[PDB]
Amino acid sequence: LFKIRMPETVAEGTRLALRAFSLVVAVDEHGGIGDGRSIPWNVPEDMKFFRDLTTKLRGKNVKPSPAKRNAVVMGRKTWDSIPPKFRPLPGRLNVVLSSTLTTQHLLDGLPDEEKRNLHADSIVAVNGGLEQALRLLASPNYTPSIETVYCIGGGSVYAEALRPPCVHLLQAIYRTTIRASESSCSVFFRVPESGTEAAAGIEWQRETISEELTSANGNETKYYFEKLIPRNREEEQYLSLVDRIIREGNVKHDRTGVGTLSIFGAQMRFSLRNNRLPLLTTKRVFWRGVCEELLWFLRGETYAKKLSDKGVHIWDDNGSRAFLDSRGLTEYEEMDLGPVYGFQWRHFGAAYTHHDANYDGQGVDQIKAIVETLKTNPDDRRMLFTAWNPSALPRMALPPCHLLAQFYVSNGELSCMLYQRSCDMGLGVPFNIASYALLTILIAKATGLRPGELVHTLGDAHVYSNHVEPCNEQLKRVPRAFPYLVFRREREFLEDYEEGDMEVIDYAPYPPISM
Amino acid sequence: MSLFKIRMPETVAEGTRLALRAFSLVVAVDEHGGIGDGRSIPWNVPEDMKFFRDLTTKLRGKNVKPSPAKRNAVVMGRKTWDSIPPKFRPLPGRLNVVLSSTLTTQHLLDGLPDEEKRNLHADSIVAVNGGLEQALRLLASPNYTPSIETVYCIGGGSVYAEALRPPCVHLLQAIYRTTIRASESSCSVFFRVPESGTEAAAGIEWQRETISEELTSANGNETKYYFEKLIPRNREEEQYLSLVDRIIREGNVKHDRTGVGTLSIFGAQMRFSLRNNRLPLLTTKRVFWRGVCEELLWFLRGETYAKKLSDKGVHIWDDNGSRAFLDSRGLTEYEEMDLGPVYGFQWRHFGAAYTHHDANYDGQGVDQIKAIVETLKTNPDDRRMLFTAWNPSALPRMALPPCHLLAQFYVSNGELSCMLYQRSCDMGLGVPFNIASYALLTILIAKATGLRPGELVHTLGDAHVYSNHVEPCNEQLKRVPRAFPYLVFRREREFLEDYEEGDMEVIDYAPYPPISMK
Ligand SMILES: NC(=O)C1=CN([C@@H]2O[C@H](COP(=O)(O)OP(=O)(O)OC[C@H]3O[C@@H](n4cnc5c(N)ncnc54)[C@H](OP(=O)(O)O)[C@@H]3O)[C@@H](O)[C@H]2O)C=CC1
Ligand SMILES: NC(=O)C1=CN([C@@H]2O[C@H](COP(=O)(O)OP(=O)(O)OC[C@H]3O[C@@H](n4cnc5c(N)ncnc54)[C@H](OP(=O)(O)O)[C@@H]3O)[C@@H](O)[C@H]2O)C=CC1
Numbered sequence A: 001l002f003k004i005r006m007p008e009t010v011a012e013g014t015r016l017a018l019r020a021f022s023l024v025v026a027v028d029e030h031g032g033i034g035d036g037r038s039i040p041w042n043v044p045e046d047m048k049f050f051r052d053l054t055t056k057l058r059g060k061n062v063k064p065s066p067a068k069r070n071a072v073v074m075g076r077k078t079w080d081s082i083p084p085k086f087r088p089l090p091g092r093l094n095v096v097l098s099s100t101l102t103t104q105h106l107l108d109g110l111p112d113e114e115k116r117n118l119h120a121d122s123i124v125a126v127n128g129g130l131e132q133a134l135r136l137l138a139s140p141n142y143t144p145s146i147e148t149v150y151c152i153g154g155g156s157v158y159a160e161a162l163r164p165p166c167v168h169l170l171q172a173i174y175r176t177t178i179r180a181s182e183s184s185c186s187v188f189f190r191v192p193e194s195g196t197e198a199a200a201g202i203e204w205q206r207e208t209i210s211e212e213l214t215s216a217n218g219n220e221t222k223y224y225f226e227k228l229i230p231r232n233r234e235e236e237q238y239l240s241l242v243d244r245i246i247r248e249g250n251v252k253h254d255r256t257g258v259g260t261l262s263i264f265g266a267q268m269r270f271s272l273r274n275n276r277l278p279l280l281t282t283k284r285v286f287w288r289g290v291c292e293e294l295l296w297f298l299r300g301e302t303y304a305k306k307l308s309d310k311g312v313h314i315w316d317d318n319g320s321r322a323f324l325d326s327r328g329l330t331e332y333e334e335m336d337l338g339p340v341y342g343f344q345w346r347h348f349g350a351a352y353t354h355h356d357a358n359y360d361g362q363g364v365d366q367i368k369a370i371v372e373t374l375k376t377n378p379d380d381r382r383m384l385f386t387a388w389n390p391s392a393l394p395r396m397a398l399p400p401c402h403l404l405a406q407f408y409v410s411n412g413e414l415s416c417m418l419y420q421r422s423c424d425m426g427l428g429v430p431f432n433i434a435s436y437a438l439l440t441i442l443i444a445k446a447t448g449l450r451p452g453e454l455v456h457t458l459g460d461a462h463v464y465s466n467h468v469e470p471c472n473e474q475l476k477r478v479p480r481a482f483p484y485l486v487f488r489r490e491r492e493f494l495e496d497y498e499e500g501d502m503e504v505i506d507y508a509p510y511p512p513i514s515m
Numbered sequence B: 001m002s003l004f005k006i007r008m009p010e011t012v013a014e015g016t017r018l019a020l021r022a023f024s025l026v027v028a029v030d031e032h033g034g035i036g037d038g039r040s041i042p043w044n045v046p047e048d049m050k051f052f053r054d055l056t057t058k059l060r061g062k063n064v065k066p067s068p069a070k071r072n073a074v075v076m077g078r079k080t081w082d083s084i085p086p087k088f089r090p091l092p093g094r095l096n097v098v099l100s101s102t103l104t105t106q107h108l109l110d111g112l113p114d115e116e117k118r119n120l121h122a123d124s125i126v127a128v129n130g131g132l133e134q135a136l137r138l139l140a141s142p143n144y145t146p147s148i149e150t151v152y153c154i155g156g157g158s159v160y161a162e163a164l165r166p167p168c169v170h171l172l173q174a175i176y177r178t179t180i181r182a183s184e185s186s187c188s189v190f191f192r193v194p195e196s197g198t199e200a201a202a203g204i205e206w207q208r209e210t211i212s213e214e215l216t217s218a219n220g221n222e223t224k225y226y227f228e229k230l231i232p233r234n235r236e237e238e239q240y241l242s243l244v245d246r247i248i249r250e251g252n253v254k255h256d257r258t259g260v261g262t263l264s265i266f267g268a269q270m271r272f273s274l275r276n277n278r279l280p281l282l283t284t285k286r287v288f289w290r291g292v293c294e295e296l297l298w299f300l301r302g303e304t305y306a307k308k309l310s311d312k313g314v315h316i317w318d319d320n321g322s323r324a325f326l327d328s329r330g331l332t333e334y335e336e337m338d339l340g341p342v343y344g345f346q347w348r349h350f351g352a353a354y355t356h357h358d359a360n361y362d363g364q365g366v367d368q369i370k371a372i373v374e375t376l377k378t379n380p381d382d383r384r385m386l387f388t389a390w391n392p393s394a395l396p397r398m399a400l401p402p403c404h405l406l407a408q409f410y411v412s413n414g415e416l417s418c419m420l421y422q423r424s425c426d427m428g429l430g431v432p433f434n435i436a437s438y439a440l441l442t443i444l445i446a447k448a449t450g451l452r453p454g455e456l457v458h459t460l461g462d463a464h465v466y467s468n469h470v471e472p473c474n475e476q477l478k479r480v481p482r483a484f485p486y487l488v489f490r491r492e493r494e495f496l497e498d499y500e501e502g503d504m505e506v507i508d509y510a511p512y513p514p515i516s517m518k
């Protein structure tokens, strides 16, 4: 009656079509890969790289299990190409593509029946191409259980992975070049050139290229590595704005002596399309604090102890008994922030006494109203909610930073525009971009629409003074490919969604800023 | 009131005073760029000679002959003055301003033929003991500004040189150059328009508004000559021109209940410089500024009764202040033209309770503008100086929601910048008006806080173009932006709410003629 009841489309909105994936390959100086059924040359170093890459998980502590393991997708012939001894490849879910052999078939070509069972959960075949496997890898069984998918083989499987619709899901390309002149290979491996029609908009760029190496296999084979990634313009916006602030910003100093370089006015754009979640990659974002807090906003919650009992401490300092009293909010119990954010969203202007009191029905529920208009007249131009309430500011532990947001609908996709008066580029902005990408996605699921874009308007954009060096280290990193957001399960009411219902997948941030 | 009102600081006139008046430059060169061999113009071409005359004499909007209360003015070095045949001196229909460190206004006068001539041209001849810069400075005075419509630098190698370099170059609205095929006339002084990207161009990008075909003069030798009107590329206005264009070519088409169709995109942001009395009044389509100025002053005063606008010849609220529209919103209790707690009421009484427009609201609600003003003056780095009119509570009580619902002020180097947030932006008639409103407010708020105007950042939400406006907003696209005009205050006030539309005037606004489609 007070809560927003999710529609019967709820899940159909964000259903993950195809699981993203990386690609591993070896090529000779001529771009050749091999001829039909063999890789004539053999470089132990490359072999090891393959073993480690495709098998290890990022969590430098966990060993592959049927709960968390990487997956390897390959074409039949390539499977045939594996020494019946090394098959299936250990520690990885082996996905063979073939319109003949079946899960039981591949399995029976294996010697010792001991493994013909120990490798029953390790082998699976699909009667289709990479797309269908990427599609079968997107189901609840495999996602998020399978951490990373590696398309390991087949000039035929490669061709598909390098062309739409698959390429749009290609997170990275690892390419070892074995400088061992050989004509064995017939099929050449080509990464689509930038700007051409085969690149379907994707700009492949090298993230890392090694120096010429020589394998210790008594052949002095010359080889080297390459990790190519799809240029992420989006994350660049962020990095550009930052680098500009540092370089040309205005250095202002607090009354507490805090330094900030800043510029006024700026706008960035992000695509929430096809399960894409814009979590920066140049510095890991605390997604859980985002989800737990956003969810907290949606419920009009005002009690910070709730995020606190959940590990999210973003409101501790402004919820201290000291702080609260320094605001004259002496009657507020510690951690009772007042009518901040979510409260104004769901109850604009309602009288606030304590976080205990029931507020159902109270005030103006801007969100319940945005949900209802979106579903009846999506072309309306007044679908925006605000927490910036001049009258209630004094009763708030603090004035809101992200104080306004408007929605827009076109061709069934919901877009959102956020207005942030003040934003810290070091920790706030990345966090907030997350917050509103998550808010827009839910609001869509709740309105029978499909996520579109998130437009971020910054007012006072500033890099704190002692972030300059770190933010410089980060500015060095090349942005990678954004992760994706899936939903394990749904809820009947928006207000009932928990952080354990959505899983972030394929998020591969760089290491902590080595400071 | 008084304490209710916003008192303007002493420096109220210090940050808006106009230093250098804007001007155009008219000159003639030979195929090699020579103006003359510092002795004379070795070539006189009839057709051009007429162009110079009409160009520097005529005023905007024909059927208006010059007068002492409204005339153009020409600036020239003493020699060039000397080179005008004493008889046709001074150029008639224009304020003849002469640069000379040896001649005084009186001396120039003594140079005319007789006392009669000296008494008829008293107020048409003035001497400035300085350069073009001092002439533009003097012209910037209340005596000649806005009195003098257009200043034309008519000549002098010495003057062109000054005219084409900082600081004066930043006030060169346009260059009118005539190229004549002067045979063997190997003069000495060269007139060269700084190229794009070079240091000398000082960041300006001179482009041709117009150029004429090679023309043949019906004089004696048939000397061939041509015309050029160079102007300083205005990226700022192209901002809007690009977005409009992107909307027509790529926007999404939509038709609401009324059946009114529009194309549109979502999310945009432009920037406009308000430094040095600059006013971002769009030039490819005349903006109704009298209305803009009236309504902004209406907004700041905290008004809600549309009538005060229609009594001043402004009807931008007639449709939404009517009897039917009012009722159609359930506002039956409201008198006709009483829009309710709209815009300014929230600006000066956020949250206050409304009854009627003639009610007394002093001390009621939060006076946001009054607060931003006091903070700008004491803690200009505060990251919370923004007023809002998007108040969900009173929304149902207004004649309709605000389109420009949020503004935020920023300070840097004593320059007040202002960002605006607009949910519904009508690119054809709406956007240009709003860019003027928030340009005016920023200027006014800067004045009220001892600050110099900075930039205006405009954030667009739902930016559209009506289908009815598509063809014309396409003709306009053709038009190449011209330099923006300026804003000068002819008087000041004790309080911010006291300013009337007449206390200020836009000068040097040269908008392209109305569009050729009814
Ligand atoms: N040097 C290196 O780094 C690498 C070398 N290689 C070499 O490449 C060669 C393999 O390449 P290639 O001949 O292209 O073979 P693949 O290994 O790609 O296998 C192709 C086979 O996979 C199946 N398949 C592919 N697409 C589909 C589809 N859309 N639907 C159903 N089944 C499909 C078919 O099996 P079926 O016909 O049974 O139905 C098909 O004939 C080998 O010699 C291998 O050693 C491979 C990877 C890396
Ligand atoms: N083809 C064309 O379109 C044009 C051709 N001409 C030709 O150019 C020649 C004139 O050029 P030029 O010799 O450069 O003369 P100018 O016409 O520029 O006159 C120079 C004089 O102007 C005054 N002046 C300039 N700058 C200053 C300053 N900063 N402070 C004080 N006084 C200043 C001085 O007066 P004072 O002497 O009292 O110190 C000075 O000597 C003429 O032969 C004229 O016919 C001129 C205009 C246009």
Ligand SMILES: Nc1nc(N)c2c(OCCCOc3cccc(F)c3)cccc2n1
Pocket: A024, A025, A026, A039, A046, A047, A050, A078, A081, A082, A083, A086, A089, A152, A153, A174, A175, A176
């Ligand atoms: N950079 C890279 N990528 C591969 N994808 C690869 C490979 O892939 C072919 C799939 C068959 O895998 C094996 C695994 C172990 C032994 C073997 F002979 C084949 C085989 C050898 C080197 C390789 N090197």
Ligand SMILES: Nc1nc(N)c2c(OCCCOc3cccc(F)c3)cccc2n1
Pocket: B026, B027, B028, B029, B048, B049, B052, B076, B080, B083, B084, B085, B154, B155, B176, B177, B178
């Ligand atoms: N394209 C162009 N530009 C000028 N700037 C110009 C001019 O400049 C005016 C300065 C000197 O003015 C006179 C006016 C009348 C007679 C005379 F000899 C000089 C005079 C005549 C033609 C001109 N033509």
